[PDB]
């Protein structure tokens, strides 16, 4: 197996995953590392099984059909790992934690958002559809664009939406477009 993980790229106290050679620190992985289970697969592994059991899972889909879904057990999975993607780059360091907003000439969003809540609401199962967590997510990076107006850090929320957008597509098999 890795010996950084996966998300964070650093050492430290690491799970194996006992299907891939992929490894995590126990908070980084998305849910939490789970406390016995042998073997253990990480979420990689899961949502390949998905694809494998069902691959006509992979078949383009509508994002309005997608919002839509519920959060039934595979939905919640790969929301999961959507969020999982995102942490994965390093610039979310930006939108993990709460934000604060005390800029000349801004004012801070009515609805602050940020990654570490929409962690909290998945793993409290607040999100009924997929649409919520989508919604929260993309919250974030909108707030932020809003937020910095011309400062070039506004570049940071593009790009970190770029990644959950790209990620969104691929593991919900949306239907390619030009
Ligand atoms: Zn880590
Ligand atoms: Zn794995
Ligand atoms: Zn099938």
Same mark, same amino acid.
């Given at each position: 197996?890795?010996?950084?993980?996966?998300?964070?790229?650093?050492?430290?106290?690491?799970?194996?995953?006992?299907?891939?050679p992929r490894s995590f620190h126990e908070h980084c992985?998305?849910?939490?590392?789970?406390?016995?289970?042998?073997?253990?697969?990480?979420?990689?592994?899961?949502?390949?099984?998905?694809?494998?059991?069902?691959?006509?899972?992979?078949?383009? %889909?509508? *994002?309005?059909?997608?919002?839509?879904?519920?959060?039934?057990?595979?939905? +919640?999975?790969?929301?999961? =790992?959507?969020?999982?993607?995102?942490?994965?780059?390093?610039?979310?360091?930006?939108?993990?934690?709460?934000?604060?907003?005390?800029?000349?000439?801004?004012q801070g969003p009515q609805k602050p958002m940020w990654?570490?809540?929409?962690?909290?609401?998945?793993?409290?199962?607040?999100?009924?559809?997929?649409?919520?967590?989508?919604?929260?997510?993309?919250?974030?990076?909108?707030? %932020?664009? *809003?937020?910095?107006?011309?400062?070039?850090?506004?570049?940071?929320?593009? +790009?970190?939406?770029?990644? =959950?957008?790209?990620?969104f597509r691929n593991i919900f098999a949306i239907q390619?477009?030009?």
């Amino acid at each position: 197996n890795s010996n950084i993980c996966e998300v964070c790229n650093k050492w430290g106290r690491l799970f194996c995953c006992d299907t891939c050679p992929r490894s995590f620190h126990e908070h980084c992985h998305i849910p939490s590392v789970e406390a016995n289970k042998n073997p253990w697969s990480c979420i990689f592994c899961r949502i390949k099984t998905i694809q494998e059991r069902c691959p006509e899972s992979q078949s383009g %889909h509508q *994002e309005s059909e997608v919002l839509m879904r519920q959060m039934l057990p595979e939905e +919640q999975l790969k929301c999961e =790992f959507l969020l999982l993607k995102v942490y994965c780059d390093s610039k979310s360091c930006f939108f993990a934690s709460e934000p604060y907003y005390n800029r000349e000439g801004s004012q801070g969003p009515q609805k602050p958002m940020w990654l570490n809540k929409v962690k909290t609401s998945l793993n409290e199962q607040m999100y009924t559809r997929v649409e919520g967590f989508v919604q929260d997510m993309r919250l974030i990076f909108h707030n %932020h664009k *809003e937020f910095y107006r011309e400062d070039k850090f506004t570049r940071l929320g593009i +790009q970190v939406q770029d990644i =959950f957008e790209k990620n969104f597509r691929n593991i919900f098999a949306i239907q390619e477009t030009s």
